[PDB]
Amino acid sequence: LGGYMLGSAMSRPLIHFGNDYEDCYYRENMHRYPNQVYYRPVDQYSNQNNFVHDCVNITVKQHTVTTTTKGENFTETDIKIMERVVEQMCITQYQRESQAYYQRGA
Amino acid sequence: LGGYMLGSAMSRPLIHFGNDYEDCYYRENMHRYPNQVYYRPVDQYSNQNNFVHDCVNITVKQHTVTTTTKGENFTETDIKIMERVVEQMCITQYQRESQAYYQRGA
């Protein structure tokens, strides 16, 4: 987190969880999951999936560390829900970044 | 953690912390910090520092998540000590991997 960008706070999708329990737990604790993602500049990534994997791994790391040093915890359900919450945000980000970067103008 | 290798359990250096408190806390809680690292195959990395940054970020993520879902926590001191513990292991790994990969034989 020093060669890392912090993308904007963005409007969250209500993610779909097939698992009703997961849905419920997500809805019940929704404000615990990240609002912004961290990521490396798009030019460093051949595709979307290299970018998304990286943005997910960095974002969950950052967010878990922040939480754990405050003395709080995530359950296994919390983790599954978060990787999917963060995943959809990272995709969004890739599309923004990847286009803004490929845009030719001029 | 699916395009990730799990390197061997290895003999740990006794890392140097200038901060005496950090030293003390490290020594006192030494068995909490990771024994093996996770990393992507070396061929995916131009240099050492791209590899090390990645191996550190993945390893601390994995280890924090494991800890937090067990209901336990890391302090801010725990985190600083871990990134340095993990850092030295990742360097080691890079050197092994990077040579074993560059080795020409034949």
Side-chain angles (χ1 to χ4, degrees):
Chain A
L1 200 97
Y4 276 94
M5 294 216 258
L6 175 36
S8 289
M10 321 276 195
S11 203
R12 39 134 87 94
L14 179 64
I15 305 303
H16 179 245
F17 296 89
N19 186 285
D20 301 346
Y21 178 80
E22 273 172 22
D23 179 66
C24 194
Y25 199 85
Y26 166 49
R27 282 192 185 206
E28 171 85 23
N29 300 291
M30 201 177 64
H31 295 330
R32 302 181 59 103
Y33 310 114
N35 286 107
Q36 35 196 336
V37 303
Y38 300 90
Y39 64 93
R40 274 208 175 154
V42 63
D43 21 316
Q44 327 212 333
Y45 301 99
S46 36
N47 52 206
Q48 166 167 316
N49 288 320
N50 278 4
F51 172 95
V52 160
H53 179 105
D54 183 32
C55 164
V56 183
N57 287 358
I58 181 43
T59 300
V60 162
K61 182 222 159 176
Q62 206 50 58
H63 191 78
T64 298
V65 159
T66 292
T67 302
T68 197
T69 68
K70 278 157 38 174
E72 311 192 355
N73 19 84
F74 295 126
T75 63
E76 215 151 47
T77 310
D78 270 319
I79 307 305
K80 152 76 173 269
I81 290 164
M82 178 178 37
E83 300 198 334
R84 209 126 112 202
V85 178
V86 170
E87 203 203 10
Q88 285 306 298
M89 284 177 306
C90 279
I91 281 148
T92 309
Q93 204 56 33
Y94 177 68
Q95 305 186 314
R96 273 147 153 85
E97 289 309 283
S98 146
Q99 156 185 57
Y101 170 68
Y102 277 124
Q103 237 307 43
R104 311 167 186 86
Chain B
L1 200 97
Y4 276 94
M5 294 216 258
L6 175 36
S8 289
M10 321 276 195
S11 203
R12 39 134 87 94
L14 179 64
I15 305 303
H16 179 245
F17 296 89
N19 186 285
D20 301 346
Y21 178 80
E22 273 172 22
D23 179 66
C24 194
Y25 199 85
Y26 166 49
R27 282 192 185 206
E28 171 85 23
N29 300 291
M30 201 177 64
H31 295 330
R32 302 181 59 103
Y33 310 114
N35 286 107
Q36 35 196 336
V37 303
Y38 300 90
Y39 64 93
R40 274 208 175 154
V42 63
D43 21 316
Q44 327 212 333
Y45 301 99
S46 36
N47 52 206
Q48 166 167 316
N49 288 320
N50 278 4
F51 172 95
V52 160
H53 179 105
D54 183 32
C55 164
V56 183
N57 287 358
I58 181 43
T59 300
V60 162
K61 182 222 159 176
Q62 206 50 58
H63 191 78
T64 298
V65 159
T66 292
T67 302
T68 197
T69 68
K70 278 157 38 174
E72 311 192 355
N73 19 84
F74 295 126
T75 63
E76 215 151 47
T77 310
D78 270 319
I79 307 305
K80 152 76 173 269
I81 290 164
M82 178 178 37
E83 300 198 334
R84 209 126 112 202
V85 178
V86 170
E87 203 203 10
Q88 285 306 298
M89 284 177 306
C90 279
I91 281 148
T92 309
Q93 204 56 33
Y94 177 68
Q95 305 186 314
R96 273 147 153 85
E97 289 309 283
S98 146
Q99 156 185 57
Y101 170 68
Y102 277 124
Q103 237 307 43
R104 311 167 186 86

